[PDB]
Ligand binder design. Structure first.
Ligand code: GNP
Ligand code: MG
Lengths: 479, 171
């Protein structure tokens, strides 16, 4: 019972013989996996006795360090309070424990396992990073020395996936100094069929495509980031994790070099399948619809039309309460309709056709408080009106003109929303009547939006186009 | 990283543009070099003239179908390299069209260098050796320096002489 553990602590607290001790805690390892009770609830072990027994009594030893750093990981799972006591040490110890034992494929798996079980806390990652060890050198050396071992490659990578998110914005640009690229990418080659390795490698590559002097080296021809496509095609056709991570990476890669992606046809034919197959993971939508709204000029400069629009309507309808989904989705719908005129005939209120104009209308009227959604929504209702003479008769009756003028006057301190709303008011009225109350209510608001942005070249162009539609009865028109 | 360049490599297909870019940047060579499906980088860092130089090498297609897409990149190119294979004569006679595209799209500070590839078949060379500078008797920036990718003969001479000729002029 507990008195046995008291004897064990009394034995481990006093070092007399260097070899017998490795029995006592070893029996404790049995009581570690003996699930008869949580007898390790005293909190005396594993945090104040076992760390001095683990660093002092055998620093260099594989005698005691192996079973000690195995007991610590078996303890952290069952006894939870140790996760609060390890920091707030265990972090100066583990770097030396990886440094000294640099040459064991069976004593580094347990070090990286304690690392991948330890970094999940936070506030110990920070204390590991601020040290003399430079832990990335240690994990990269352990990955370099051990190919074909399935657990150093994983339990690593998963320990980088959580360590690259908080490093720097300059150390990240440094690791593209012919390092990250070789170890991380190669693991992808040896274990291209195991899931978790590929998912964590896609995560890690996603986490160092953040700078701008790094998207060049990743999209280059020496380490070509079209491993995203093979990963999305073979090692995970039907698992949302790798699809979401791969596609967010592909959204991050589309800098000013589009004509590498879209020409290599498998980098715009696969993102569309990732949208249409998974319409219920909002991160996938806010990545993919933005990526395809960027790439659509190139993918239509070179059916293929019908790809996006069903998915964009499904994204508008479902994720109503989100703002990023609606911004990106109506962005993609606008930039699809503006570069493929034919399916203008396929977006309407009648049967079969999709009623997306009502959805963009309600998606603007809900999210009044945000400038980006009104920006992209006015750009998406502009194109949906300039090629039709029947959508400018429903919105004119439902009352969208008062609503868009109140929206413009609420966001009075931005030129983007003024320009987009003024373009909507210009396209909406053309070829209609004007019951003088409409003009008497509108034209002061457009003049207010005209003398508060007196530098922007399209906010008076669109304005001195839009006011042109409005310029007894004489005893009212004189007034 | 003190300076970035934009040196492009243009030429009719089959000559070996990709082979020269590979011999300069990563020294690899496979005889069945798959043709470039479009444009492609191959980034390089060279240290010369007391400066670090981030050289970008845009390898281009060479077909007639992609001739529009490549047209987007002739503007920023600090130095343009034109190539013709000495075994096929029409691969040299394309050069009026390439020079037309250069004179249409390029800038004013764009040095234009000609390179003859695959010199190890000089004994089978259906194009001579004198014809190069004889064609380069046009605008005086047009150098000429034959080389050969598969045998690594005068390969890096091309790029090093070109980057020296570039950065010896601009401040
Ligand atoms: N012996 C020898 N063979 C060469 C040399 N350069 C190219 N070749 C051969 O010629 C082939 C032509 O392919 P490639 O290098 O792509 O020519 P390319 O004009 O650049 N093709 P593209 O521009 O369409 O990408 C090469 O695959 C190689 O077998 C050279 O210097 N010597
Ligand atoms: Mg080639």
């Amino acid at each position: 019972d507990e008195e046995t553990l008291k004897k064990l602590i009394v034995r481990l607290n006093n070092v007399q013989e260097g070899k017998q001790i490795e029995t006592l805690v070893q029996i404790l390892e049995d009581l570690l996996v003996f699930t008869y009770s949580e007898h390790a609830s005293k909190l005396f072990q594993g945090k104040n006795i076992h760390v001095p027994l683990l660093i002092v009594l055998d620093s260099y030893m594989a005698s005691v360090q192996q079973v000690g750093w195995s007991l610590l990981c078996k303890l952290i799972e069952v006894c939870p309070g140790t996760m609060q006591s390890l920091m707030g040490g265990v972090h100066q110890l583990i770097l030396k424990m990886l440094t000294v034992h640099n040459a064991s494929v069976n004593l580094s798996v347990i070090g990286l396992k304690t690392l991948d079980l330890l970094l999940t806390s936070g506030k110990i990652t920070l204390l590991i990073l601020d040290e003399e060890s430079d832990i990335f050198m240690l994990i990269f050396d352990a990955m370099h020395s051990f190919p074909a071992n399935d657990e150093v490659q994983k339990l690593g990578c998963k320990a980088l996936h959580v360590l690259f998110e908080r490093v720097s914005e300059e150390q990240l640009t440094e690791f593209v100094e012919n390092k990250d690229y070789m170890i991380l990418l190669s693991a992808l080659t040896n274990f291209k069929d195991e899931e978790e390795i590929v998912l964590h490698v896609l995560h890690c590559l996603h986490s160092l495509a953040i700078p701008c002097n790094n998207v060049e080296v990743l999209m280059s021809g020496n380490v070509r980031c079209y491993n995203i496509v093979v990963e999305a095609m073979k090692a995970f056709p039907m698992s949302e994790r790798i699809q979401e991570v791969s596609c967010c990476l592909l959204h991050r890669l589309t800098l000013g070099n589009f004509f590498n992606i879209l020409v290599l046809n498998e980098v715009h034919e696969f993102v569309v399948k990732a949208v249409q197959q998974y319409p219920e993971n909002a991160a996938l939508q806010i990545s993919a619809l933005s990526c395809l709204a960027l790439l659509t000029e190139t993918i239509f400069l070179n059916e293929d039309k019908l790809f996006w629009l069903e998915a964009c309507y499904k994204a508008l309808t479902w994720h109503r309460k989100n703002k990023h989904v609606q911004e990106a989705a109506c962005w993609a719908l606008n930039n699809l309709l503006m570069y493929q005129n034919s399916l203008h005939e396929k977006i309407g209120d009648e049967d079969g056709h999709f009623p997306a104009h009502r959805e963009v209308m309600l998606s603007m009227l809900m999210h009044s408080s945000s400038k980006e959604v009104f920006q992209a929504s006015a750009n998406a209702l502009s194109t949906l009106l300039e090629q039709n003479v029947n959508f400018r008769k429903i919105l004119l009756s439902k009352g969208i003109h008062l609503n868009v003028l109140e929206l413009m006057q609420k966001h009075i301190h931005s030129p983007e929303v003024a320009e987009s709303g003024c373009k909507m008011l210009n396209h909406l009225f053309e070829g209609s009547n004007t019951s003088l109350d409409i003009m008497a209510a509108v034209v002061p608001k457009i003049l207010t939006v005209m003398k508060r942005h007196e530098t922007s070249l399209p906010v008076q162009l669109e304005a001195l186009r839009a006011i042109l539609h409005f310029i007894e009865f004489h005893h009212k028109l004189n007034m | 990283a003190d300076f970035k360049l934009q040196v492009i490599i243009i030429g009719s297909r089959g000559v070996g543009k990709t082979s020269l870019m590979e011999r300069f940047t990563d020294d690899t060579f496979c005889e069945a070099c798959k043709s470039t499906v479009g444009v492609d980088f191959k980034i390089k860092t060279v240290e010369l003239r007391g400066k670090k130089i981030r050289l970008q090498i845009w390898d281009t297609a060479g077909l007639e179908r992609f001739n529009s897409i490549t047209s987007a990149y002739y503007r920023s190119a600090k130095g343009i390299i034109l190539v013709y294979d000495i075994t096929k004569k029409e691969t040299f006679d394309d050069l009026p069209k390439w020079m037309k595209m250069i004179d249409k799209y390029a800038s004013e500070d764009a040095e234009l260098l000609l390179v003859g590839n695959k010199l190890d078949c000089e004994t089978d060379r259906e194009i001579t050796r004198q014809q190069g500078e004889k064609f380069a008797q046009q605008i005086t920036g047009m150098r000429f320096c034959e080389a050969s990718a598969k045998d690594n003969f005068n390969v890096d001479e091309i790029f090093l002489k070109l980057v020296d000729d570039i950065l010896k002029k601009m401040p």
